[PDB]
From Swiss-Prot, chain B:
Entry protein name: Tyrosine-protein kinase Mer
Record-annotated active site: D127
Recorded disease: Retinitis pigmentosa 38: A retinal dystrophy belonging to the group of pigmentary retinopathies. Retinitis pigmentosa is characterized by retinal pigment deposits visible on fundus examination and primary loss of rod photoreceptor cells followed by secondary loss of cone photoreceptors. Patients typically have night vision blindness and loss of midperipheral visual field. As their condition progresses, they lose their far peripheral visual field and eventually central vision as well.
Source organism per UniProt: Homo sapiens (Human)
Effect the entry attributes to changing A112S: In a head & Neck squamous cell carcinoma sample; somatic mutation
GO terms for biological process, alphabetical: cell migration; cell surface receptor protein tyrosine kinase signaling pathway; cell surface receptor signaling pathway; cell-cell signaling; establishment of localization in cell; natural killer cell differentiation; negative regulation of cytokine production; negative regulation of leukocyte apoptotic process
Location within or outside the cell: Cell membrane
Subunit text: Interacts (upon activation) with TNK2; stimulates TNK2 autophosphorylation. Interacts (via N-terminus) with extracellular ligands LGALS3, TUB, TULP1 and GAS6. Interacts with VAV1 in a phosphotyrosine-independent manner. Interacts with TIMD4; this interaction enhances TIMD4-mediated efferocytosis.
Chain sites annotated for binding ATP: L18, G19, E20, G21, E22, F23, G24, S25, V26, K40
Residue span, Protein kinase domain: 12-245
Coiled-coil segments on the chain, per record: none
Keyword match ATP-binding: yes
GO CC terms in record: cytoplasm; extracellular space; photoreceptor outer segment; plasma membrane; receptor complex
Tissue-specific expression: Not expressed in normal B- and T-lymphocytes but is expressed in numerous neoplastic B- and T-cell lines. Highly expressed in testis, ovary, prostate, lung, and kidney, with lower expression in spleen, small intestine, colon, and liver.
Length: 236, 250
């Protein structure tokens, strides 16, 4: 209630995309400093307290929810553009791993606060002006096997592994050749996302540990965040 | 004389399901031939007259119709499946080895050769796309799923006027070359299906892939020219693709 903003401080503009229960739009937020800020517009007070560069920060509420502007949009669509000329230059492995470290750092933050991000995917990750990724939106091919049957932080670890696959493949859709209805039986028989072509075995061993049948056998986000930071260290 | 294309039902043994057609499912089966030997086939589910016009086709880059049962379409079995899924797999180390450019062009040439054969008979393939292209046992591509009855494959003029000419097939083929050059990417990343007409109407087209040759992109770009009369025919495309392929090392 403390951070609800006066509606008449918000100028709405064009649509940027669609949402779960409405549209996402650009906007200008007039601040207490006097200047106007470019924002995106669509309980939530529990996220005004969230403070982490790799987590996306709530500015206020008008119902409309006032969020920052990530001029590079979602990570998923950004990965596909990179594979096209005119779009961003071909993303090397180092930059790809940095995308995974930022997300792990953000999930390491929310997991320590016992917050579950039930729709973690490459499409729900946003790119700041400094190319640093931060999680948002907190879909069968991302749901862990145990959650298909019936959700914990170990289920986000699973979805994180799928996101590492989306990044490693630069925008491929998970499980090519498998239909959504075939996923449970496909996973229940012990199959997992195959290894991308030029993906280091060191990197595939990490994302593979995210899909271990028993949730307790999967690593925590803090463990994953370091396995990735250290692999990135070992690269020139 | 339309009896020639109807196969007796008791000559067909159906098995598992392999996928979904737009109007019906797809299944495996055995076709007992006049030769006395059984053939592995796929079975998809006025109609009976077009199948007869197609059973007289004979081209390696065009899938052959073996007959019809009572309705079901009997077709060869391709253990390598469609081209679209084969492109995604190639990017997985478990699947086919990385496909070089030369092999990618041989896919385009094959598809163009089959489409050249169909245009020489005024036959329209009103839904050409990588998913609708099958790989023979020798890796030659043959077009399928044509006849008998996807916004990002329909030509701009066919979206509005509800028209479709051979030049509209050239459009879909141009988008098909894009799928091959990208190894399975969905066309127009960052654009919704409901935005396609306005996107194309303002003059936007598929962006050149990362490593795609400028010469290969100019060919596929010509397929999306606003005026259908400016797009090349399939016989012109096939030769432009065959010559570019010969200009590369073995
Ligand atoms: C490369 N190229 C560059 C130019 N691009 C154009 C473009 C257009 C818009 C934006 C953008 C800008 N800002 C935002 N903000 C945003 C962030 C997250 C959500 C969601 C959710 C959510 C967000 C929050 C939150 O509150 C404060 C901070 O975070 C809390 C709980 N849930 C929605 C909007 N989106 C943005 N995009 C959304 C719009 C639709 C959405 O479904 C996916 C991404 C970016 C780029 C195209 C690509
Ligand atoms: C153990 N068991 C399990 C693992 N299996 C792996 C497997 C399974 C199936 C096939 C396969 C094999 N053959 C085919 N052939 C095929 C060809 C064309 C169509 C279509 C058709 C159609 C054709 C016409 C036409 O008739 C004459 C001219 O035009 C009109 C409308 N529709 C469907 C299947 N697909 C196949 N699959 C396609 C089916 C459509 C799509 O889902 C992609 C894959 C391959 C591998 C196999 C073994
Ligand atoms: Cl407003
Ligand atoms: Cl996979
Ligand atoms: Cl049967
Ligand atoms: Cl054939
Ligand atoms: Cl594009
Ligand atoms: Mg979303």
């Amino acid at each position: 209630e403390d951070v609800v903003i006066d509606r008449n401080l918000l100028i709405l503009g064009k649509i940027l995309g669609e949402g779960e229960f409405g549209s996402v739009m650009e906007g200008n937020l007039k601040q207490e400093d006097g200047t106007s800020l470019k924002v995106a517009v669509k309980e939530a007070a529990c996220m005004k307290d969230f403070s982490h560069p790799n987590v996306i920060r709530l500015l206020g509420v008008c119902p409309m929810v006032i969020l920052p502007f990530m001029k590079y949009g979602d990570l998923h669509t950004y990965l596909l553009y990179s594979r096209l000329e005119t779009g961003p230059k071909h993303i090397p492995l180092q930059t790809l791993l940095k995308f995974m470290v930022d997300i792990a750092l953000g999930m390491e933050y929310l997991s320590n606060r016992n917050f579950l991000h039930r729709d973690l995917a490459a499409r729900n990750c946003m790119l700041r002006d400094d190319m640093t990724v931060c999680v948002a939106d907190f879909p069968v091919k991302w749901i862990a096997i145990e959650s298909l049957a019936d959700y914990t932080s170990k289920s986000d670890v699973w979805a994180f592994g799928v996101t590492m696959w989306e990044i490693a493949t630069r925008g491929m859709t998970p499980y090519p050749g498998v239909q959504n209805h075939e996923m449970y039986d496909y996973l229940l028989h012990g199959h997992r996302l195959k290894q991308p072509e030029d993906c280091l075995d060191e990197l595939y061993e990490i994302m593979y540990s995210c899909w271990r049948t028993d949730p307790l056998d999967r690593p925590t986000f803090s463990v994953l965040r370091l396995q990735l930071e250290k692999l990135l260290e070992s690269l020139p």
